[PDB]
Amino acid sequence: XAXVXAXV
Amino acid sequence: XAXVXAXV
DNA sequence: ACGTCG
DNA sequence: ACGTCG
Ligand SMILES: *C(=O)c1cnc2ccccc2n1
Ligand SMILES: *C(=O)c1cnc2ccccc2n1
Ligand SMILES: *C(=O)c1cnc2ccccc2n1
Numbered sequence A, B: 001x002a003x004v005x006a007x008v
Numbered sequence C, D: 001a002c003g004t005c006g
């Protein structure tokens, strides 16, 4: 849920 | 993830 | 259940 | 020369 590299 | 030159 | 740049 | 999460 975090999106720092993916944002899922 | 680190931004030391890109910051992704 | 998700992976990234100069 | 450096790693970023709910
Ligand atoms: C987002 O909150 C979150 C938490 N755990 C994960 C595990 C695997 C893929 C994506 C996820 N996203
Ligand atoms: C994004 O591509 C990415 C990959 N690995 C991680 C590990 C821990 C926190 C955040 C991350 N983000
Ligand atoms: C950030 O933590 C991080 C780690 N590895 C990477 C590889 C390629 C592009 C960006 C990256 N960012």
Ligand SMILES: *C(=O)c1cnc2ccccc2n1
Residues within 6 Å of the ligand: B004, B005, B006, C006, D001, D002
């Ligand atoms: C920033 O543009 C950049 C390019 N190469 C690196 C190599 C190692 C650590 C940090 C770096 N930052």
Ligand SMILES: [K+]
Residues within 6 Å of the ligand: A003, A004, A005
């Ligand atoms: K982001």
Ligand SMILES: [Mn+2]
Residues within 6 Å of the ligand: C003
């Ligand atoms: Mn991964």
Ligand SMILES: [Mn+2]
Residues within 6 Å of the ligand: D003
């Ligand atoms: Mn690394």
